[PDB]
Design a protein around this ligand. Structure first.
Ligand SMILES: NC(=O)c1cc([N+](=O)[O-])c(Cl)cc1NCc1cncnc1
Length: 294
């Protein structure tokens, strides 16, 4: 209500329902997300408002935050498609390496900007990466997780995807660092390359064990302090690490090298977005035009 004309429902968003809407005034087309629950903290409104100032070409612009009678409305710049749908559509042929590289490079620029401004995403996944016809890709939902501590679910009994969760979160760490986003982005990079989710767990423990089966069960050597983590159990099975050549074939050594650094167990050893941008993998990065059908 008030200035907005609903064009259609986009989906059952993470924090609520989402509509494509037109601002009767400006005439602009936007994504409007209606947030839960029956209170809505004033701390969240302030923190969220802060995000309106977080502007970068690879970050979906938060145009407005509107608090009104039990419901928070977030108005975002609109993009027609997300990476999850694009990957499904490119399943038979695969996304061309040059485009995978362009997307990864752009997402790292976005993360570097967010992280330098002390903003974490915390829930990166293909569905939260939006793309347009110009070859741009943008991070969506940056900072919402913190302005709400822990998201948990959507609003209509939906199965929370754990596929992109960093191991420190799964092991009960209470303090997230910028490293959790690099881990999620690494999982997404692998998925674009192989056309299959890297760690498709269907429970928190299945997610953790899928990670362990591929990267090896972590220990104090590769991850100092891991055995003192909240949910770590000495009873975890001990699996040997597999070779990356087997995990993301036929990605080249530059790609495997970068991916391995994005998937280090120790959050402190995990590569930063800034450092990743300098990796030899991006020596020949370009900005291709995607084949997008809308
Ligand atoms: N910012 C946005 O444009 C956007 C926001 C949200 N959201 O949650 O606030 C969602 Cl779901 C999807 C979006 N767009 C991608 C899309 C658009 N139309 C049809 N399928 C996908």
């Amino acid at each position: 209500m008030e200035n907005f004309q609903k064009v259609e429902k986009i989906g059952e968003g993470t924090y609520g329902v989402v509509y494509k809407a037109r601002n009767k005034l400006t005439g602009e087309v936007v994504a409007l997300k209606k947030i839960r629950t029956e209170g809505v903290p004033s701390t969240a409104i302030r923190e969220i408002s802060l995000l309106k100032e977080l502007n970068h070409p690879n970050i979906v612009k938060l145009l407005d935050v509107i608090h009104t009678e039990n419901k928070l409305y977030l108005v975002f710049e609109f993009l027609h498609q997300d990476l999850k749908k694009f990957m499904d559509a490119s399943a038979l042929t695969g996304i061309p390496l040059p485009l995978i590289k362009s997307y990864l490079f752009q997402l790292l620029q976005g993360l570097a900007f967010c992280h330098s401004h002390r903003v974490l995403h915390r829930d990166l996944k293909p569905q939260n990466l939006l793309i347009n016809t110009e070859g741009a890709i943008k991070l969506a939902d940056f900072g919402l997780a913190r302005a709400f501590g822990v998201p948990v679910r959507t609003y209509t009994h939906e199965v929370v995807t754990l596929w992109y969760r960093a191991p420190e979160i799964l092991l009960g760490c209470k303090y997230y660092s910028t490293a959790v986003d690099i881990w999620s982005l690494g999982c997404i990079f692998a998925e674009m390359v192989t056309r299959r989710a890297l760690f498709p767990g269907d429970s928190e423990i299945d997610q953790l064990f899928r990670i362990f089966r591929t990267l090896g069960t972590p220990d104090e050597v590769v991850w100092p302090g891991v055995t003192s983590m909240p949910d770590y159990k000495p009873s975890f099975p001990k699996w040997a690490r597999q070779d990356f050549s087997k995990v993301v074939p036929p990605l080249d050594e530059d790609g495997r090298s970068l991916l391995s650094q994005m998937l280090h167990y120790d959050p402190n050893k995990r590569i930063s977005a800034k450092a990743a941008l300098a990796h030899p993998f991006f020596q020949d990065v370009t900005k291709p035009v995607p084949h997008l059908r809308l």
